[PDB]
């Protein structure tokens, strides 16, 4: 880490700069989509899927 | 407005008193939205 730029927390690519996603707004967003789910018990979208 | 100047070295509590907050996290510019 930190020669080749830890890579985006929200996508592919391991290792990069890639000028990502910022972790505070990350977990924002991870948030907001956490209570939105929880707000009506919205069936997860992997069975959505199936 | 001033006479002279003074050197020294910098406590903790004078560089405490400068500072009007203390930094965290290494990211610039989000870039998508312009705001910091």
């Keep these: 880490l930190e020669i080749r730029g830890a890579?985006?927390?929200l996508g592919?690519?391991?290792?990069?700069?890639?000028?990502?996603?910022?972790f505070?707004?990350?977990?924002?967003?991870?948030?907001n989509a956490v209570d939105a789910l929880k707000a009506g018990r919205e069936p997860s979208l992997e069975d959505l899927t199936s | 407005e001033f006479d002279?100047?003074?050197?020294?070295?910098?406590?903790?509590?004078?560089?405490?008193?400068w500072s009007f907050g203390e930094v965290k996290?290494?990211?610039?510019?989000?870039?998508?939205?312009?705001?910091p």
């Design chain 1, 12 to 22: 592919e690519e391991q290792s990069g700069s890639m000028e990502t996603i910022g």
């Design chain 2, 25 to 35: 996290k290494p990211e610039t510019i989000n870039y998508r939205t312009f705001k």
């Design chain 1, 7 to 9: 890579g985006e927390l």
């Design chain 2, 4 to 17: 002279a100047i003074k050197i020294a070295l910098a406590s903790p509590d004078m560089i405490r008193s």
């Design chain 1, 24 to 31: 505070s707004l990350y977990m924002e967003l991870l948030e």
